[PDB]
Write an enzyme that holds these catalytic residues in place. Sequence first.
Site, mmCIF file in Angstrom:
data_model
loop_
_atom_site.group_PDB
_atom_site.id
_atom_site.type_symbol
_atom_site.label_atom_id
_atom_site.label_comp_id
_atom_site.label_asym_id
_atom_site.label_seq_id
_atom_site.Cartn_x
_atom_site.Cartn_y
_atom_site.Cartn_z
ATOM 1 C CG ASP A 153 -1.764 1.161 1.415
ATOM 2 O OD1 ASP A 153 -2.785 1.200 0.694
ATOM 3 O OD2 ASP A 153 -1.449 2.018 2.239
ATOM 4 C CD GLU A 183 -2.321 2.343 -3.620
ATOM 5 O OE1 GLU A 183 -1.741 2.570 -2.549
ATOM 6 O OE2 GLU A 183 -3.470 2.762 -3.870
HETATM 7 O O1 ZXY Z 1 -10.559 11.884 1.280
HETATM 8 C C1 ZXY Z 1 -9.888 11.046 1.866
HETATM 9 N N1 ZXY Z 1 -8.554 11.031 1.810
HETATM 10 C C2 ZXY Z 1 -7.776 11.960 1.021
HETATM 11 C C3 ZXY Z 1 -7.656 11.540 -0.439
HETATM 12 C C4 ZXY Z 1 -7.101 10.130 -0.618
HETATM 13 O O2 ZXY Z 1 -5.698 10.123 -0.328
HETATM 14 C C5 ZXY Z 1 -5.199 8.958 0.132
HETATM 15 C C6 ZXY Z 1 -4.325 8.155 -0.706
HETATM 16 C C7 ZXY Z 1 -3.845 8.563 -2.031
HETATM 17 C C8 ZXY Z 1 -4.634 9.141 -2.997
HETATM 18 C C9 ZXY Z 1 -4.083 9.541 -4.203
HETATM 19 C C10 ZXY Z 1 -2.721 9.387 -4.444
HETATM 20 O O3 ZXY Z 1 -2.162 9.789 -5.620
HETATM 21 C C11 ZXY Z 1 -1.916 8.854 -3.465
HETATM 22 O O4 ZXY Z 1 -0.591 8.714 -3.753
HETATM 23 C C12 ZXY Z 1 -2.465 8.437 -2.259
HETATM 24 O O5 ZXY Z 1 -3.822 7.015 -0.215
HETATM 25 C C13 ZXY Z 1 -4.113 6.544 1.036
HETATM 26 C C14 ZXY Z 1 -3.538 5.346 1.406
HETATM 27 C C15 ZXY Z 1 -3.809 4.840 2.679
HETATM 28 O O6 ZXY Z 1 -3.270 3.689 3.085
HETATM 29 C C16 ZXY Z 1 -4.635 5.523 3.547
HETATM 30 C C17 ZXY Z 1 -5.212 6.716 3.176
HETATM 31 O O7 ZXY Z 1 -6.026 7.344 4.047
HETATM 32 C C18 ZXY Z 1 -4.960 7.221 1.907
HETATM 33 C C19 ZXY Z 1 -5.542 8.497 1.478
HETATM 34 O O8 ZXY Z 1 -6.284 9.163 2.235
HETATM 35 C C20 ZXY Z 1 -10.559 9.950 2.675
HETATM 36 C C21 ZXY Z 1 -10.676 10.300 4.155
HETATM 37 C C22 ZXY Z 1 -9.634 9.486 4.882
HETATM 38 C C23 ZXY Z 1 -9.373 8.258 4.016
HETATM 39 N N2 ZXY Z 1 -9.813 8.678 2.674
HETATM 40 C C24 ZXY Z 1 -9.582 8.054 1.526
HETATM 41 O O9 ZXY Z 1 -10.016 8.535 0.484
HETATM 42 C C25 ZXY Z 1 -8.758 6.818 1.528
HETATM 43 C C26 ZXY Z 1 -8.230 6.428 0.348
HETATM 44 C C27 ZXY Z 1 -7.320 5.288 0.099
HETATM 45 C C28 ZXY Z 1 -7.096 4.269 1.033
HETATM 46 C C29 ZXY Z 1 -6.223 3.232 0.704
HETATM 47 C C30 ZXY Z 1 -5.541 3.245 -0.511
HETATM 48 O O10 ZXY Z 1 -4.652 2.265 -0.895
HETATM 49 C C31 ZXY Z 1 -5.767 4.245 -1.429
HETATM 50 O O11 ZXY Z 1 -5.126 4.266 -2.632
HETATM 51 C C32 ZXY Z 1 -6.670 5.252 -1.127
HETATM 52 CL CL CL Z 2 -4.441 -1.288 -5.736
#
Ligand code: ZXY
Ligand code: CL
EC number: 3.2.1.1
Length: 496
Positions: free
Chosen positions: A197, A233
């Site tokens: 991740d 990832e």
């Molecule tokens: O709007 C949110 N978050 C901000 C936008 C998403 O950015 C995140 C990315 C992300 C987004 C775009 C990118 O280019 C990047 O490099 C990273 O990776 C994560 C990975 C994690 O292990 C835990 C996280 O909370 C995130 C995360 O918040 C909501 C609220 C908290 C969790 N979440 C989420 O939206 C959670 C999303 C999430 C969780 C697990 C993942 O593996 C993932 O890709 C996304």
């Molecule tokens: Cl993935």
Amino acid sequence: QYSPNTQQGRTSIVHLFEWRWVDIALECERYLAPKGFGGVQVSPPNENVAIYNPFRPWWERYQPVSYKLCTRSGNEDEFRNMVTRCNNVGVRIYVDAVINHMCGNAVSAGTSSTCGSYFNPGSRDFPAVPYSGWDFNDGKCKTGSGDIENYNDATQVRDCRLTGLLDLALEKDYVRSKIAEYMNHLIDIGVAGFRLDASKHMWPGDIKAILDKLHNLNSNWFPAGSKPFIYQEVIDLGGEPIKSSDYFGNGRVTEFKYGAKLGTVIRKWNGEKMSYLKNWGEGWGFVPSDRALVFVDNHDNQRGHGAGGASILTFWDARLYKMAVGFMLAHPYGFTRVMSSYRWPRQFQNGNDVNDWVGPPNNNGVIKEVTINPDTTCGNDWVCEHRWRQIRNMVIFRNVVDGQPFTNWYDNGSNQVAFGRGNRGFIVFNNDDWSFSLTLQTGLPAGTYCDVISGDKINGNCTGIKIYVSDDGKAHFSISNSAEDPFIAIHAESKL
Ligand SMILES: O=C(NCCCOc1c(-c2ccc(O)c(O)c2)oc2cc(O)cc(O)c2c1=O)[C@@H]1CCCN1C(=O)/C=C/c1ccc(O)c(O)c1
Ligand SMILES: [Cl-]
Ligand SMILES: *[C@@H]1O[C@H](CO)[C@@H](O)[C@H](O)[C@H]1NC(C)=O
Ligand SMILES: [Ca+2]
């Protein structure tokens, strides 16, 4: 690290997102083994924060509290039971390894965690690991907020807090060793590999140093010297400094351009059309096939504002989704992952789903069992895309045609296309607003073949469309734009 360690002739993994260990174990035995699936990506199996506002969101599992194998999916004994039972039927387990970070820096201290371990984010204390303030990147991050602010600065992307998540000091041997202790526990249980991740948020060389500490796979099930499969990832859609190629020395990478572009093509956005897919693969700017983990959607971007935004196709778009999954499973590029989802009350306001946080089906926070209906679909709001006939039969298609070249491409210059996989399979798609009725060269031996999209070969007969291939390899295909599924697929094992 590049080989999946599936059994020969099994070519896909399925993400059983938020499934409980006992249900995965049963699914291995009753479905995944007989239907030819290679393995299962499990949700993070380590203890996470229990988040009650909002109520038990899926994303709480990406906020570690410890490396105890104690989650809403089950405990360590249940996890081991699943891995054993799955390996004993030749279906592998791949762990979602959340190793860049612990939980949010502003999460309240206490025991609101899936195994009841104490943790105190504000003091950087995770005594169940243990980690302390010495183990985080507070001092190394240079941003004014302490969080990632600007993806044009590749250093802060790695050293600062993703969305406020406490960022582990992965240069430190102690931290690398605690992560390897967790991962080696899992390898020695029998896991076949890992999704890493948030790999974009880790330095390639720190990942490498962790991987250098990992065991070979458990020698009761795997040949001596087998390395864990690694897929990192890395969300790389272009236009940022970090390139997923920097990670190729560690393992495969997720190719998020794959589903983003396939979604735009199948939706016919911006003038794109299926005839353009003739050179699908590296010609579209993708990573080398032998470094790609591909998928139409994943657990984040199926909620509509991940990598690809609104172009991503999901089970909600069932007709186009089956088409996209079918194209992916027929085409030789990449190692394929099929998504398996749950339904939630999606509620768009101003173009965004306000219920995108909702966690898996549950009773008072306890995840519901997967029930199997007589027609082989699932109950309890599990979508079970991997059980849809049109998807399961394409998982089998990919096995049947493994190793065969892409050949016999046809297109009408618009959205009617077809291609073969050597002499073992052929697939035909109609995504235009009119009928596709044409005789095509299939590359297959003469005979009668069951279409595995509209039906099945059962008891020496076809339950859906039948295709008749002549001595010249040609066959007539007819697909109305009104068909339930506007694509047909035939292969060597669907021949009567
Ligand atoms: O709007 C949110 N978050 C901000 C936008 C998403 O950015 C995140 C990315 C992300 C987004 C775009 C990118 O280019 C990047 O490099 C990273 O990776 C994560 C990975 C994690 O292990 C835990 C996280 O909370 C995130 C995360 O918040 C909501 C609220 C908290 C969790 N979440 C989420 O939206 C959670 C999303 C999430 C969780 C697990 C993942 O593996 C993932 O890709 C996304
Ligand atoms: Cl993935
Ligand atoms: C196929 O279907 C036909 C018509 O229902 C039936 O007579 C036959 O027994 C079935 N099986 C085979 C192997 O032909
Ligand atoms: Ca980091």
